[PDB]
Amino acid sequence: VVGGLGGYMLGSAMSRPLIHFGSDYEDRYYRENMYRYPNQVYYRPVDQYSNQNSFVHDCVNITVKQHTVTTTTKGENFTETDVKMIERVVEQMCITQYQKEYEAYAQRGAS
């Protein structure tokens, strides 16, 4: 199990995000299963933890890991594209997560 990441929390929730992958079918291969994704993501404070860039890639990984171990405990492994299907969503949801901090870290944060 996990149980001591550092400063992380779970949020509250959101909806599913909308990502336009590039291809017409990439835009759908994720959508045809989107209900399998959660409403939350795990995240930590900003406190300038290596920009947003070298936080969001750590952020996604901490959430994707559970969707991983849920199935990888069997040993079905995970391809590069199947993680990317998830992590397009975990990026969006993580950025939304962090944007509630961004207003206070920045000045406005806007939307």
UniProtKB/Swiss-Prot annotation:
Transmembrane segments: none annotated. It is found in: Cell membrane; Golgi apparatus. Disulfide bonds join 59-94. Belongs to the prion family. Monomer and homodimer. Has a tendency to aggregate into amyloid fibrils containing a cross-beta spine, formed by a steric zipper of superposed beta-strands. Soluble oligomers may represent an intermediate stage on the path to fibril formation. Copper binding may promote oligomerization. Interacts with GRB2, APP, ERI3/PRNPIP and SYN1. Mislocalized cytosolically exposed PrP interacts with MGRN1; this interaction alters MGRN1 subcellular location and causes lysosomal enlargement. Interacts with KIAA1191. Its primary physiological function is unclear. Has cytoprotective activity against internal or environmental stresses. May play a role in neuronal development and synaptic plasticity. May be required for neuronal myelin sheath maintenance. May play a role in iron uptake and iron homeostasis. Soluble oligomers are toxic to cultured neuroblastoma cells and induce apoptosis (in vitro). Association with GPC1 (via its heparan sulfate chains) targets PRNP to lipid rafts. Also provides Cu(2+) or Zn(2+) for the ascorbate-mediated GPC1 deaminase degradation of its heparan sulfate side chains. This is Major prion protein. A lipid is attached at residue 110 (GPI-anchor amidated alanine). The normal, monomeric form has a mainly alpha-helical structure. The disease-associated, protease-resistant form forms amyloid fibrils containing a cross-beta spine, formed by a steric zipper of superposed beta-strands. Disease mutations may favor intermolecular contacts via short beta strands, and may thereby trigger oligomerization. Contains an N-terminal region composed of octamer repeats. At low copper concentrations, the sidechains of His residues from three or four repeats contribute to the binding of a single copper ion. Alternatively, a copper ion can be bound by interaction with the sidechain and backbone amide nitrogen of a single His residue. The observed copper binding stoichiometry suggests that two repeat regions cooperate to stabilize the binding of a single copper ion. At higher copper concentrations, each octamer can bind one copper ion by interactions with the His sidechain and Gly backbone atoms. Coiled coil: none annotated. Glycans are attached at residues 61, 77. It is linked to Found in high quantity in the brain of humans and animals infected with degenerative neurological diseases such as kuru, Creutzfeldt-Jakob disease (CJD), Gerstmann-Straussler syndrome (GSS), scrapie, bovine spongiform encephalopathy (BSE), transmissible mink encephalopathy (TME), etc.
